[PDB]
C-alpha cells in the first residue's frame, strides 16, 4: 500500500493504472471535506438493500456493491448511472457501458426486509451480547448482508490440489507442552549428541 499525505480516491484502487493516471506522483489537490463517521457509528455495508432519496433516480431500491469509507461513498448496482465507453481505437468506439456513479451516504437509507421501507438504523446490543441493527421507525431487527469474498473462492465448493493440506491433518493437535525449546527438541529427536560446551564470554 502506497499513500501520499493529500490524496483523492477516484473509485480507482490506490495501487492501479487508472489511479496513477488520475493522480500522478506529484499532485496535491484541494482538501476533500469528509463528515466524520466513526467505524462503530457506521450503519452501512456492501450487499444490503437500500433506498435512494436523492437525485433524478429516487424512491428506488437497490443492492450495494462496495463502500469506500475514506471519502464516504456507497455503490448501488446499476442504479445511479452515467455512460462510459470502454474500447476506443482510431476507427472504432466499442462497448458503451452504463456505469455506477458513486452516492453519498446522506442520500441512502437502509431498507428493512419485511415491509421494504427506508429507515434509520441504530445499533443495539442484545441481552446475549450480539450487535444488531434496530429500526427506529419500524421497530425491527435489520440483518447485515452476508456477502461473498473478494477472491471468489467459496469454501463449500473446494478441492485440494497437490499442495493443499487436508482439513483433518491441519486440525490435528500434535503439541506436547514440555519445557524444551525448538533447539533441544529437534536435536534430541534427530539424535545429534553434543558434548563440549561454550567457554565463558563477556558482554559489552
Partner 1 sequence: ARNVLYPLYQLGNPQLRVFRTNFFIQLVRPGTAQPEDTVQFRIPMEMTRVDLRNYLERIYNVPVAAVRTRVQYGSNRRRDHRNIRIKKPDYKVAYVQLALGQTFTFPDLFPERKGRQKHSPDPRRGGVPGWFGL
Partner 2 sequence: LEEFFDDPKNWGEEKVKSGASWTCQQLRNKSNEDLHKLWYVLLKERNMLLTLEQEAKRQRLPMPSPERLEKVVDSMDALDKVVQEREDALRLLQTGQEKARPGAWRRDIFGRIIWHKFKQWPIPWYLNKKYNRKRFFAMPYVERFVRMRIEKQARIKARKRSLERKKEKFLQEKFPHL
Partner RNA sequence: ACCAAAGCUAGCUCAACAACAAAUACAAAAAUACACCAAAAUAAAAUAAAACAUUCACCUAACAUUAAAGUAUAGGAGAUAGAAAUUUUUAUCCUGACGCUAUAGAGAUAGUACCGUAAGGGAAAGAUGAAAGAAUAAAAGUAAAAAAAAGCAAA
Partner RNA sequence: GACGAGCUACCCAUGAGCAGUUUAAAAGAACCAACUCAUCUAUGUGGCAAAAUAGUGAGAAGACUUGUAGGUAGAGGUGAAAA
Partner RNA sequence: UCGCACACGCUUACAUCAGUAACUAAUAAUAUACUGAUAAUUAACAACCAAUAAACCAAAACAACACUAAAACGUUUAUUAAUUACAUUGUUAACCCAACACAGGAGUGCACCAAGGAAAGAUUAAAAGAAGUAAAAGGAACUCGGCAAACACAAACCCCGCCUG
Q: Please give the grid coordinates belonging to residue 203.
A: 558482554
**Residue among 18, 70, 126, 136 that touches RNA (CB under 7 A):** 18
Give, as ranges, the residues between 140 and 169 that touch partner 2 (CB under 8 A).
151, 153, 160-165
To the nearest whole angstrom, how small is the minimum distance from the Cβ of residue 115 to RNA?
Answer: 30
**Distance in angstroms (rounded) separating the CA atoms of residues 113 and 18:** 37
Q: Is the dihedral of CA 178, 181, 182, 184 positive or negative?
A: negative
191 touching partner 2, by CB under 8 A: no
For Cα atoms 26, 17, 47, give the angle at the middle one, nearest 5 degrees.
Answer: 115
To the nearest whole angstrom, how small is the minimum distance from the Cβ of residue 201 to partner 2?
Answer: 5
Cα-flanking dihedrals φ and ψ of residue 183, to 5°? -70, -55
To the nearest whole angstrom, how small is the minimum distance from the Cβ of residue 78 to RNA?
Answer: 10
182 touching partner 2, by CB under 8 A: yes
Q: Which does 141 bind (CB under 5 to 8 A by kind): partner 2, partner 1, RNA, none?
A: none
Burial class for 145, CB neighbours closer than 10 Å (0-12, 13-18, 19+): middle
Binding-residue pattern over the window 94 to 113 for RNA, x denoting contact by CB under 7 A: -----xxxx-x---------
149 touching RNA, by CB under 7 A: no
8 touching RNA, by CB under 7 A: yes
**Residue among 129, 175, 192, 193 that touches partner 2 (CB under 8 A):** 175
Q: Which does 198 bind (CB under 5 to 8 A by kind): RNA, partner 1, partner 2, none?
A: partner 1
Question: Within 13 Å and on the Cβ side, how many CA atoms surround 62?
Answer: 21
118 by DSSP, 3-state: which? Answer: strand
Amino acid at each position: 500500500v502506497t499513500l501520499p499525505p493529500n490524496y483523492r480516491y477516484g473509485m480507482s484502487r490506490p495501487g492501479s493504472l487508472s489511479d496513477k493516471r488520475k493522480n500522478p506522483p506529484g499532485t496535491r489537490r484541494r482538501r476533500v471535506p469528509v463528515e466524520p463517521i466513526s467505524d462503530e457509528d457506521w450503519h452501512l455495508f456492501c450487499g444490503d438493500k437500500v433506498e435512494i432519496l436523492e437525485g433524478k433516480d429516487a424512491g428506488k431500491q437497490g443492492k450495494v456493491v462496495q463502500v469506500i469509507r475514506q471519502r464516504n461513498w456507497v455503490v448501488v448496482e446499476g442504479l445511479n448511472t452515467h455512460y462510459r465507453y470502454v474500447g476506443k481505437t482510431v476507427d472504432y468506439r466499442g462497448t458503451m457501458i452504463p456505469s455506477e456513479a458513486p452516492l453519498l451516504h446522506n442520500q441512502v437509507k437502509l431498507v428493512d426486509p419485511t415491509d421494504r421501507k427506508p429507515t434509520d438504523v441504530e445499533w443495539r446490543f442484545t441481552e446475549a451480547g450480539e450487535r444488531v441493527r434496530v429500526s427506529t421507525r419500524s421497530g425491527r431487527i435489520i440483518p447485515k448482508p452476508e456477502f461473498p469474498r473478494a477472491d471468489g473462492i467459496v469454501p463449500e465448493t473446494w478441492i485440494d490440489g497437490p499442495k493443499d493440506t487436508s482439513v483433518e491433518d491441519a486440525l490435528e493437535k500434535t503439541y506436547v507442552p514440555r519445557l524444551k525449546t525448538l533447539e533441544e527438541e529437534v536435536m534430541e529427536a534427530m539424535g545429534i549428541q553434543e558434548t563440549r560446551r561454550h567457554k565463558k564470554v563477556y558482554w559489552y
